Design a protein around this ligand. Structure first.
Ligand SMILES: [Mg+2]
Length: 170
């Protein structure tokens, strides 16, 4: 029930949904529908849910996914269209995720030659979505790295290989 754990779950779900959304668009008519069984096929999601819950059985794994996805419904990123297992599936709002891409693009573009880092972009996305009706952020660090890497694969962003390190003061 911690706010940090909710964010970590929601961020894996954000990536998965965006990944499915982009796959479906390429292979195709107007709407994109994803099954809960397709959302479930991600190792990090399973590993993240396995931190606090027993999700070795599918139904229990699916239950906990449906629970975390209720917040996605209330912010209009998804809409449930089939309710009765084995047919639990959702329509993805293409505007919601395109808006995420518009905001990410503008944030990094306005920085120009100074550029920015992963925290900055995360705070900026979150401030600009302004989803105060949930009470934890949906944007995790792992979702931001997936976006940054996606942008790099489309030649939009160049990632620096330099890192800072510090002497540990005894
Ligand atoms: Mg993620």
């Amino acid at each position: 029930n911690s706010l940090k754990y909710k964010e970590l779950i929601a961020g894996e779900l954000m990536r998965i949904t965006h990944k499915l959304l982009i796959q479906k668009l390429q292979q195709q008519k107007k709407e994109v529908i994803i099954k809960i069984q397709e959302i479930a096929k991600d190792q990090q999601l399973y590993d993240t849910l396995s931190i606090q819950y027993q999700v070795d059985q599918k139904e229990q794994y699916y239950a906990k996914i449906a629970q975390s996805l209720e917040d996605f419904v209330s912010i209009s990123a998804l809409k449930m269209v089939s309710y009765i297992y084995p047919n639990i599936s959702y329509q993805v709002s293409i505007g919601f995720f395109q808006n995420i891409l518009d905001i990410a693009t503008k944030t990094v573009k306005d920085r120009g030659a100074l550029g920015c880092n992963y925290k900055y972009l995360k705070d900026k996305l979150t401030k600009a979505l302004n989803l105060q009706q949930i009470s934890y952020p949906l944007i995790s660090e792992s979702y931001i790295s997936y976006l940054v890497h996606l942008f790099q694969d489309f030649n939009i962003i160049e990632i620096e290989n330099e890192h800072k390190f510090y002497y540990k003061q005894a």
